[PDB]
Amino acid sequence: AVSLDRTRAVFDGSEKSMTLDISNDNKQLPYLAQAWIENENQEKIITGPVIATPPVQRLEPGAKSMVRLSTTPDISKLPQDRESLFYFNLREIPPRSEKANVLQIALQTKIKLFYRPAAIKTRPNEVWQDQLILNKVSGGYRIENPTPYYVTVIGLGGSEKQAEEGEFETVMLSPRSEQTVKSANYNTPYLSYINDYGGRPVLSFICNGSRCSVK
Amino acid sequence: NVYIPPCTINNGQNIVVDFGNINPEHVDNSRGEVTKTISISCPYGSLWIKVTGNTMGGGQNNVLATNITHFGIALYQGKGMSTPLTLRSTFTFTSVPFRNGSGILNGGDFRTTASMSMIYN
């Protein structure tokens, strides 16, 4: 199977292109790798504002290559004070099985592609997720994301272990938004999220009544 | 590398559900229900799986068309023809031949393809 090098891609709006590494992990057969972009509703767009090339390429067993993500002039039309959401897709076209009477599975990877305008370009060590605010309500918390970035929440517990381990319905807050999640009550809430690199940091909150903020 | 990579699917091997040598003339209600289990090895689950592909006409929502008219492959979640499959850890799915018509079928051999998307959070 053909695999990508990451679980999310961040397109730095200050640049006009970027590349993602792919590789054919199969040690026997060569694969075709289809790549395309989808908008925030997971609908395929072939005209921009973000393009993927090549649309298809051949990968020898164990070989690695890349896909180039680039923008069009219409990229300027997206708002510049917040991230926009796209999805990058890579589907493998396996070799025709010699054996007939078979069901062949074509694997595909779909990851979020965050367009991040130059006006909100982040520093290398910048952490904006510590700006999240938790408001206790019946059955859980109303999470507020006042930042210009999408934030994916993967955990929420009364300890560091629960946050990262505990069962949780992952949700992604769009820029400057809020949404309620189900959860037990915690004295010192801990929240886990997926950052730009795929790391899963844990945050610690301190509460002042029903409103909790990062320590 | 700096970027945490996505999970590897059944050790980068090819996934093929083989039905062996069978005549497309079956009961499609309990036949070559071939079950498949593919492994998911991740770096850190936060992943969704959607299956899509060409479907036959009719009201069924879990049947893939094949290269044989009136003949398709029905899909079910987990081992067993119980719960249908609308079109570290493991994922099991059951595939069973299905013919939506009586009469002659143009083809002794059949093959079809479905896409299995790993959608990351």
Considering the domain delimited by A122-213, tell me its CATH architecture: Sandwich (2.60)
Q: Does the beta-carbon distance from A100 to B73 stay under 8 Å?
A: no
Breaks (C-N over 2.5 A) in chain B follow: 44, 87
| Determination approach | X-ray
Chain B residues touching chain A at CB-CB below 8 Å: 1-6, 8-22, 34, 38, 43-44, 46, 64, 73, 95, 109-121
Point out which residues pair with B93 in neighbouring strands.
Answer: B36, B77
Domain boundary assignment for chain A: 1-121, 122-213
A192 touches chain B (CB under 8 A): no
A1-121 and A122-213 have identical folds: yes
| CATH number attached to the domain at A1-121 | 2.60.40.10
Q: Are A1 and B8 in contact (CB under 8 A)?
A: yes
Q: What is the 3-state secondary structure (H, E, C) of chain A?
A: CEEECCCEEEEECCCCEEEEEEEECCCCCCEEEEEEEECCCCCEECCCCEEEECCEEEECCCCEEEEEEEECHHHHHCCCCCCEEEEEEEEEECCCCCCCCEEEEEEEEEEEEEEECHHHCCCCCCCCHHHCEEEEECCEEEEEECCCCCEEEEEEECCHHHHHHCCCCCEEECCCEEEEEECCCCCCCEEEEECCCCCCCEEEEEEECCEEEEC
Structural domains present in chain B? 7-121 (2.60.40.1090)
